[PDB]
Amino acid sequence: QYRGQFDVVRPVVRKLVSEMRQNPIDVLYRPKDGARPDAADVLMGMYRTDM
Amino acid sequence: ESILSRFDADWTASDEARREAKNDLFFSRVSQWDDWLSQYTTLQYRGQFDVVRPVVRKLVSEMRQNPIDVLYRPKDGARPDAADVLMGMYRTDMRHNTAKIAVNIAVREQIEAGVGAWRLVTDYEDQSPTSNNQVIRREPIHSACSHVIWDSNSKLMDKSDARHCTVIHSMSQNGWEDFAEKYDLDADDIPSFQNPNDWVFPWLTQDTIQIAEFYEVVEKKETAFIYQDPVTGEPVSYFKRDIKDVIDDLADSGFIKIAERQIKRRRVYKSIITCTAVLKDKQLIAGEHIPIVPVFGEWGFVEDKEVYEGVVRLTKDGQRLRNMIMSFNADIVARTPKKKPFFWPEQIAGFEHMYDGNDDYPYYLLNRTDENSGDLPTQPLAYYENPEVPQANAYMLEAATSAVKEVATLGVDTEAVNGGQVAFDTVNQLNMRADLETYVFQDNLATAMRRDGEIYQSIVNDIYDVPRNVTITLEDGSEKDVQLMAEVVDLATGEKQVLNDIRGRYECYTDVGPSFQSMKQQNRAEILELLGKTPQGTPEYQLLLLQYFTLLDGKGVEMMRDYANKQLIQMGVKKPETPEEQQWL
């Protein structure tokens, strides 16, 4: 008994997950040419609230 | 069968929590002081240690301020000025400062331990009852240790409509009068649970009376979008529907309903898993919902239960060896014979005192003789002490300290971004700017600044029947456009109470990601990236005026309040939200 407490494996784990933390990638929808949302109107307004 | 219910999982105290509650205690009581749990044959005169406090204290100070919030973003395509003064709560948000930071006492909720305890009071409150200007935020309580154990869900982040457990205030004689808004029951309630002491009765300070409190049983809302044709004709309708696929609508195939079918079970006699007694039931707190935000869900799972794990235990795995060496080197101060003067005198008991501490020179103390033995240069040189070079732990104790170095590698700090962003940021940020979705969980009465056409004004539409021509405004002489004006005025509007999710009254949403502050800080954000943002030019001089002014209309600097009055069409810089003033030459 008493081998349980030694721990210390963490430096590998806690480092990695730390430096990959922020991946915000804020970009919006480079428009498609397939349809023509010219008359869409309030439709695209809903996608302002896609936030 | 109302004796048990949830109690199927609640009888376990001496079974389940024996290890769990004791380890939750054990983590926060390892964070300071001493341990005395797993030891055998232990000796005293220790226990003040408090070794780990600072290295944990870095975290709360790093994350103590990262507000991440935005204000004043009105939403509409119509005339905006209706938003200026019409709700004073959020312009008045902070009269709360002293206890704004009181989440210090709530630091028990996350790192030092789990289990945040935050519970608000009765919604609609005492002083001058009416709705606006109520300052309550972030008020923690005593201790998180023996707090809460239940088996339900432990997944959903938000508590949805109304769920946390049942409020409990335990080991608190301050709670007796906490509800003193009660009507007075003699201060005896006493369910029987939760025994901190147990087997051995010779105890100092405790009492038998206990308190735990409950409100409603699991109110779930159903809608189901059902039309009911008389086909099978079974009673007890027993219909629960969600997805619309086949059924659709029966309207012109028969009767037309256009009504509301509510099934609300009326007064089921199950009371708080109680057998022989009834006390609490049928209460209204304003309208009732949950601003309450204690005991959030967590990370890591095994069984149906709420459990986590900690961090700094990697350090004081070596302190047991400190308390170890305190045994070995304390044995020299006592056990060791301590520097023998008397070795060479071998004669046991001599005369009265040869060394009493006298200052006189002669001590005598020489005789030796032996008969038929034989000998050689016998020397005292042996004595006892030969401890060996106790540097053995050197790089091992530097390994225990460097184990604190390894956690000191967290989120290396240099400048600006690329800092210590960590999971604990997400762990305390889960509350996540919940004010403007919290404030209205119900609507009843006593707000009505303008709504529903005031419930009277709505007929101002049709008032006068005068037969002849309808004429718009004209030039009548001196006084004209000063406000409080009535000529053609009308109203189409309407409103009522509650309707918890409603838009067209639409207000607010969450804004913009990172540490970015909204004072209009987009103007001066600047040093984040240095040069190139503020050029000039011959025409741009005019354009240089409009985008920049100091923030939140502090009267220390006025400008565009009285500086927007007129101008001229040469520039064309005018329009703010433009509530009223339009003035001809």
Curated annotation (Swiss-Prot), chain B:
GO terms for biological process: symbiont genome ejection through host cell envelope, short tail mechanism; viral DNA genome packaging; viral DNA genome packaging, headful; virion assembly. The keyword NAD does not apply. The keyword Transit peptide does not apply. Its main location: virion. It is found in: Virion. It comes from the Viruses. GO terms for cellular component: viral portal complex. Keywords: Capsid protein, Late protein, Viral capsid assembly, Viral genome ejection through host cell envelope, Viral genome packaging, Viral penetration into host cytoplasm, Viral release from host cell, Viral short tail ejection system, Virion, Virus entry into host cell. Homododecamer. Interacts with the terminase large subunit; this interaction allows the packaging of viral DNA. Interacts (via C-terminus) with the head-to-tail adapter protein gp4; this interaction participates in the head completion. Interacts with the scaffolding protein; this interaction initiates procapsid assembly, thereby ensuring incorporation of only one portal ring per capsid. Interacts with the capsid protein. Forms the portal vertex of the capsid. This portal plays critical roles in head assembly, genome packaging, neck/tail attachment, and genome ejection. Procapsid assembly may initiate with a nucleation complex composed of portal and scaffolding proteins. The portal protein multimerizes as a single ring-shaped homododecamer arranged around a central channel. Switches upon genome packaging from an asymmetrical conformation in the procapsid (PC-portal) to a symmetrical ring in the mature capsid (MV-portal). This change of conformation may serve as a signal for headful packaging. Belongs to the p22likevirus portal protein family. This is Portal protein. It comes from Salmonella phage P22 (Bacteriophage P22). The lineage of its organism: Viruses, Duplodnaviria, Heunggongvirae, Uroviricota, Caudoviricetes. The gene is 1.
